Amino acid sequence: MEFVAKLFKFFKDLLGKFLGNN
């Protein structure tokens, strides 16, 4: 299944902003 491939990846963009986008 490829349901999280986009879901889990979407949230990663929200966290990445705090995790470090440099």
Rounded Cα distance between 16 and 3, Å, is: 20
Rounded Cα gap, residues 11 and 2, in angstroms: 15
* H/E segment holding residue 2: none
b/e map 1-22, b = 16+ CB within 10 Å: eeeeeeeeeeeeeeeeeeeeee
List phi, psi (to 5°) of 3. Answer: -90, -40
3 vs 22: CA distance, rounded Å: 28
d(Cα 10, Cα 16) in Å, to the nearest integer?
A: 10
DSSP structure class, residue 15: H
State how far the Cα of 18 lies from the Cα of 9, in Å rounded to an integer: 15
C-alpha neighbours within 13 Å on the C-beta side of residue 8: 5
Q: Spell out the alpha helix ranges (H) of 1-22.
A: 4-19
**Which technique was used to obtain these atomic coordinates?**
NMR
